[PDB]
């Protein structure tokens, strides 16, 4: 009687779809599709989706629907030895919400600054740029200098970020009041849209996750008809069969699909924890996976048609203009691609709003997962008033992101995106998968799926849950632990101490699970094997 149920069946579907879509399929997926094998990227993408995303998604959805709990205390009914996975998920999601909200802050500042008949980043002639100006081409009579930069580039690095004022990661300079007020407004929006629960989430997703689709569609309509759109699609579909021989393309496709579906994060548990008792979760997982894949595909088309248009109006070979990886692709390149076209105001506004809501829905999903997990873990003093402990986590995440709002926050947000996410979430996901697959009993899980839906899955899903997906996850994490990356951003390299701190942050979340099994022994005295046999099998419901 302490749980709840969604308003309808489409509400949970749209909420999980909004959780499955983010800026990933907007910018990271197409750049990967071009760099990592060209048009020949789709086949390994589909392979890794069938073998790495759908199994995890189906398993987590079914377990969350049956057990009706979060991701912290849900192991009391499954396998209580890995309860630290819950707290690891909480702190991981704290890191994620602290670094992600800065992107929405950038987007909403772009929105609030894009209300003018002449966009402030179209011409370099403002009171902040330097003598290194270089207007959009419009001609072939100019010689671009290495030190010369596009007007939108210097706008993004000198007005919305003030990044040149940062003399290195050792110092920070100062917080920007503009971005501070912007992220404060976005945090108030998140709270006032997440206060009640899934009853309000299912109503706000109707406009939160559906509005991006119409914006993407009108952008595709605008792009696919301009002179030069064909080169974009040709480059997006031109295969390169030699690339699939290297393991790099395969592991990058695996990482892309795993981050696009995002399982093992502890939010599918909370979402399915409100679904009906015997809803068609198999259909739900399949539909969500295909919708996420199709969204990534159509977003790749949308970005690459305008990239090809820009490459025909400017010099060709989008590979050169698509130099850097990150939000700079949208905030600099696509920014100019939109600004140089007629009706630039409305198009920039709708694009910025689409990015804003594609951030907000994912933030909603993550915070829902966190609050539901903690409420299921601590229902004694909490769970009576849900409006409390939500302001707590919102203020904590805001004061954590405060360190990113500084003038040199791009480096730290890219660091948090690169190291705090991948390894921690991958180890957590693989550990919970081998727990619910090797310790809880895959035969018990199949019998449970039978009891819920009405027919047990075939041997294919069985071997995918037992053999394919664990090997897949460990292969990803081992490939990531094979080549230590030395990344950079905006002509600035990352020092070695920055790499050590990134390793520490990316490991301060995996060291969270052993302290639970350590504290399990002090409070409960006795032999080790007794606690092992008590924590390998679940207790009474």
């Amino acid at each position: 009687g302490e749980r709840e149920t969604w308003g309808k069946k489409v509400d949970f579907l749209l909420s999980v779809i909004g959780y499955a879509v983010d800026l990933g399929n907007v910018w990271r997926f197409p750049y990967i599709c071009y760099q990592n094998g060209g048009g020949a990227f789709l086949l390994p993408y589909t392979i890794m989706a069938i073998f790495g995303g759908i199994p995890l998604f189906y398993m987590e959805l079914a377990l969350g629907q049956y057990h009706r709990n979060g991701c912290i205390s849900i192991w009391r009914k499954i396998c209580p030895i890995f309860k630290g996975i819950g707290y690891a998920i909480c702190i991981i999601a704290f890191y994620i919400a602290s670094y992600y909200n800065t992107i929405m802050a950038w987007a909403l500042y772009y929105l609030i600054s894009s209300f003018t008949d002449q966009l402030p980043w179209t011409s370099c002639k403002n009171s902040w740029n330097t003598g290194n100006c270089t207007n959009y081409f419009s001609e072939d009579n100019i010689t671009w200098t290495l030190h010369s930069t596009s007007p939108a580039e210097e706008f993004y690095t000198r007005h919305v970020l003030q990044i040149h004022r940062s003399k290195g990661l050792q110092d920070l300079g100062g917080i920007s009041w503009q971005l501070a007020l912007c992220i404060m407004l976005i945090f108030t929006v998140i709270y006032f849209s997440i206060w009640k629960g899934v009853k309000t989430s299912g109503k706000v997703v109707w406009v939160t996750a559906t509005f991006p689709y119409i914006i993407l569609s009108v952008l595709l309509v605008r792009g696919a008809t301009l002179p030069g759109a064909w080169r974009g699609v040709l480059f997006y579909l031109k295969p390169n069969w030699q690339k699939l021989l290297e393991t790099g393309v395969w592991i990058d496709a695996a990482a892309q699909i795993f981050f696009s579906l995002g399982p093992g994060f502890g939010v599918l548990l909370a979402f399915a924890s409100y679904n009906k008792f015997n809803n068609n979760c198999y259909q739900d997982a399949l539909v969500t996976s295909v919708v996420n894949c199709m969204t990534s595909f159509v977003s790749g088309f949308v970005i690459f048609t305008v990239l090809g248009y820009m490459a025909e109006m400017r010099n060709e070979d989008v590979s050169e203009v698509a130099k850097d990886a990150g939000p700079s692709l949208l905030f600099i390149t696509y920014a100019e691609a939109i600004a140089n076209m007629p009706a630039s105001t409305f198009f920039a506004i709708i694009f910025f709003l689409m990015l804003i809501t594609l951030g907000l829905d994912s933030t909603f999903a993550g915070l829902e997962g966190v609050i539901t997990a903690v409420l299921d873990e601590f229902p004694h003093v909490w769970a009576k008033r849900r409006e409390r402990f939500v302001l707590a986590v919102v203020i904590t995440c805001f004061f954590g992101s405060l360190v990113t709002l500084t003038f040199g926050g791009a480096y730290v947000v890219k660091l948090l995106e690169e190291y705090a996410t991948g390894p921690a979430v991958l180890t957590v996901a693989l550990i919970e998968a081998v727990a619910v697959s090797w310790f809880y009993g895959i035969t018990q899980f199949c019998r449970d799926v039978k009891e819920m839906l009405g027919f047990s899955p075939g041997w294919f899903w069985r071997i995918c849950w037992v053999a394919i997906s664990p090997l897949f996850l460990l292969f990803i994490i081992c490939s990531f632990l094979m080549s230590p990356p030395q990344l950079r951003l905006f002509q600035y390299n990352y020092p070695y101490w920055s790499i050590i701190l990134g390793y520490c942050i990316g490991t301060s979340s995996f060291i969270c699970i052993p302290t639970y099994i350590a504290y399990r022994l002090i409070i409960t005295p006795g032999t080790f094997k007794e606690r092992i046999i008590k924590s390998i099998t679940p207790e009474t419901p």
Partner: antibody, heavy 117, light 106 residues
């Protein structure tokens, strides 16, 4: 007014290594790229690689992965090219050209590296 | 990679008449084509970039036209010093590649 100096002729035993020089004078050396071209005995031109003075980057050709290692000496406005693992046919005339970022033409060239084997 | 073929090395047009030479491109390019000269023995020099924009410092004798796949390098009535070799360059893709070039006889 904008002259670029290089090395001269050198007949070297096959298997050894030669370090080519490229002087910059007339235009700001730290503002444009520094590429190299491979041309055989009265044959076509072929691009070799790319050099950036700010960070010493190198976007080498896939057909010259190890045939030439490229470094830059911004103090003397010079950029070397470590030519290791040389054979007889790789004894071709080269050039040091300036090039701005993405018009990709070669304004001023050198005097030709008459490398004999 | 990118291959820019054209006529042979011997086939050319003598002095006084119009001399038009093309250079076949593998893929399609918008305007990223450039031509060069090189006297036998000396260093190659730039002529025209973007296939129509002559670099600052060349006489009006030089002309550039053609786009897409067919690129016309039209010259006419060369002087006693315009005789040289002419390769076709592009700016499409790494690695950039030149062409075969053509003589100028007589």
């Amino acid at each position: 007014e904008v002259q670029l100096q290089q090395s001269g002729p050198e007949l070297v035993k096959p298997g050894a290594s030669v370090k080519i020089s490229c002087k910059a004078s007339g235009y700001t050396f730290t503002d444009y790229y520094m590429n190299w071209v491979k041309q055989s005995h009265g044959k076509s031109l072929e691009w070799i690689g790319n050099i950036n003075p700010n960070n010493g980057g190198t976007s080498y050709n896939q057909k010259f992965k190890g045939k030439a290692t490229l470094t830059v000496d911004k103090s003397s406005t010079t950029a070397y090219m470590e030519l290791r693992s040389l054979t007889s046919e790789d004894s071709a005339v080269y050039y040091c050209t300036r090039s701005p970022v993405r018009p990709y033409y070669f304004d001023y060239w050198g005097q030709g590296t008459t490398l004999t084997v | 990679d990118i291959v820019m073929t054209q006529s042979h090395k011997f086939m050319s047009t003598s002095v006084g008449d119009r001399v038009s030479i093309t250079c076949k491109a593998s893929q399609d390019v918008s305007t990223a084509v450039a031509w060069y000269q090189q006297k036998p023995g000396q260093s190659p020099k730039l002529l025209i970039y973007s296939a129509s924009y002559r670099y600052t410092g060349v006489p009006d004798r030089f002309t550039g036209s053609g786009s897409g796949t067919d690129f016309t390098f039209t010259i006419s009535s060369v002087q006693a010093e315009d005789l040289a070799v002419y390769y076709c360059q592009q700016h499409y893709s790494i690695p950039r590649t030149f062409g075969g070039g053509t003589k100028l006889e007589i």
